[PDB]
Write a protein that binds this ligand. Sequence first.
Ligand SMILES: [Cl-]
Lengths: 246, 8, 7
Amino acid sequence: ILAPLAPGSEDNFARFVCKNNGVLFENQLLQIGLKSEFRQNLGRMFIFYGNKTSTQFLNFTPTLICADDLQTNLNLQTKPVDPTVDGGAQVQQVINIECISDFTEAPVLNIQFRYGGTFQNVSVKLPITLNKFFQPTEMASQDFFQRWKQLSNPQQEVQNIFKAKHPMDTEITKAKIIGFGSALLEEVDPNPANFVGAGIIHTKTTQIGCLLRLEPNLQAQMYRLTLRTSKDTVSQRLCELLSEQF
Amino acid sequence: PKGWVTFE
Amino acid sequence: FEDNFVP
Ligand SMILES: [Cl-]
């Protein structure tokens, strides 16, 4: 059997969208940390498992679980991890990642082990997301507007309106957009309060050009985000990921 | 534990 | 752009 997603899985997942390093999961027994890097359609993720106790974990078994569609879109390769984890020890695995095509689902990391006479079972969403393959595209205003207008089919645009989770801090917002994988294009939207971005999603089989506009209303503490891309599922996925960052 | 990779 | 979030 598999544990349901741990409390805070979704909140924490959201912290690994625009950055690669952090603690993915921690309770009284176990700390799971991540460090990753991506280039083009590839990635390398280190997953670290720390035994916070003085007792060995036995039959320690981390498994990367991917839905059928996800497996066709995203190749994850990793090696056996030794099933014994000494008390106070930190062990690790390397996950080599290859994006074959655009994808919407996330892998689930399930960890099971014996701890003394107990059985432990933890499930968390693993932050391998489409924007990890999103790389910035610098371009002039004129070219941006040309490209924006070429993506005028209704299904190519996805929008969200949401309450700011964080202070609407101009410099941090810029940094988050860059961390998402977008270029930050200055003086495109004539309103200097707004943010405009462009990038390309790199997959083995295809590349997708994506444009975005983020419009803050500081008085109202809300944003409107617009994505345009040539693929409806890509517009949806990037819009929903990026929406949770501000 | 000291000895562990950290994530700050 | 076609319209603006903030009038
Ligand atoms: Cl998918």
